[PDB]
Design a protein around this ligand. Structure first.
Ligand SMILES: Nc1ncnc2c1ncn2[C@@H]1O[C@H](CO)[C@@H](OP(=O)(O)O)[C@H]1O
Ligand SMILES: [Ca+2]
Ligand SMILES: [Ca+2]
Ligand SMILES: [Cl-]
Length: 114
């Protein structure tokens, strides 16, 4: 669905530019450091997290939502991912939601940003 003007992720407020930049960076695949699991990562629905997506069907992916993005990595060089994410439909890039680890119900959980 439409990228929102803003979102409040556990206190961090991001713009539509920040959200678009994250998905564009994910699709460009700018995270290439030697984490064995570089971003983007798969996103799965976990009903207990109470997260609603606005895109259609999966598969879904998630990528760090950061200021002055995109988040990126290379050998020996990492932006900090922080707690905040964009979720998008893997096949298309279509925006699904913003989520965060901040304030989540359980360890490693996500909760929906505003
Ligand atoms: N619904 C979900 N909730 C939390 N983590 C999820 C998820 N779907 C996929 N993940 C994955 O689990 C990691 C957290 O332990 C996430 O990594 P990141 O925390 O975003 O670095 C996803 O890889
Ligand atoms: Ca990558
Ligand atoms: Ca859900
Ligand atoms: Cl990475």
């Amino acid at each position: 669905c439409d990228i929102p003007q803003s979102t409040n992720c556990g206190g961090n407020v991001y713009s539509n530019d920040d959200i678009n930049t994250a998905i564009q960076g994910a699709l460009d695949d700018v995270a290439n450091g030697d984490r064995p699991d570089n971003y983007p990562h798969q996103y799965y629905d976990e009903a207990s997290e109470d997260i609603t997506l606005c895109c259609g069907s999966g598969p879904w992916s998630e990528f760090p939502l950061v200021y002055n993005g995109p988040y990126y990595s290379s050998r020996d060089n990492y932006v900090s991912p922080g707690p905040d994410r964009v979720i998008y439909q893997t096949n298309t890039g279509e925006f699904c939601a913003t989520v965060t680890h901040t304030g989540a119900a359980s360890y490693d959980g996500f909760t929906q940003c505003s």
